[PDB]
Write a structure and sequence with these properties.
mainly beta, Immunoglobulin-like, six-stranded mixed sheet, about 0% helix, about 55% strand, globular, Receptor-type tyrosine-protein phosphatase F, hydrolase, monomeric
């Protein structure tokens, strides 16, 4: 038995009007903790707001789309609770209009494209991003962060930012978004489908 401990903490994020912003929050604990989201100290609920859980509810993603300048700029609080305790952490979201975009704001030079892969073959989703400084690349699959570290080497992210999936399986099917993040902000690629076809 132990109090919840954050192992993924949402960071401040600067997004683009009409785009997407995801906050990820995860904790460990025994019993397994539950994650709850708040905006301005109130639980979330909108047509533009989606909450996707993972890790049996010990992980959670707040996804906002499309980002709207007026209403989405706010402080979002993540709370992790079990019978032993409660912890929390907040992050600010900023949303820029197109004309407020600094010159080095990340760009999607070449996004991932639709991919049909033979079962047990290796699939590779590409993502070439630009910007100044050089952006960091992460991936979401059906709105959830892809964590290569938990795949036992089967899934890995290349230094080009590409996601390489070996021994493709039924579960690898879904829509993949690549995300480019700078000190200037975050930009999502269009989603691309990965299908697994019978050999």
């Amino acid at each position: 038995d132990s109090k919840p401990v954050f192992i993924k903490v949402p960071e401040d994020q600067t997004g683009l009007s009409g785009g997407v912003a995801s906050f990820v929050c995860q904790a460990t604990g025994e019993p397994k903790p539950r994650i709850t989201w708040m905006k301005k100290g109130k639980k979330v609920s909108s047509q533009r707001f989606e909450v996707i859980e993972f890790d049996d509810g010990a992980g959670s993603v707040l996804r906002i789309q499309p980002l709207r300048v007026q209403r989405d700029e706010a402080i979002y609080e993540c709370t992790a609770t079990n019978s032993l305790g409660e912890i929390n952490t907040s992050a600010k979201l900023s949303v820029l209009e197109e004309e407020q975009l600094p010159p080095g704001f990340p760009s999607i030079d070449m996004g991932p494209q639709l991919k049909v892969v033979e079962k047990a073959r290796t699939a590779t989703m590409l993502c070439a991003a630009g910007g100044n400084p050089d952006p960091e690349i992460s991936w979401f699959k059906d709105f959830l962060p892809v964590d290569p570290a938990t795949s036992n080497g089967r899934i890995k992210q290349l230094r080009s930012g590409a996601l390489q999936i070996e021994s493709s399986e039924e579960s690898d099917q879904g829509k993949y978004e690549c995300v480019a993040t700078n000190s200037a902000g975050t930009r999502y690629s269009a989603p691309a489908n990965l299908y697994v076809r019978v050999r």
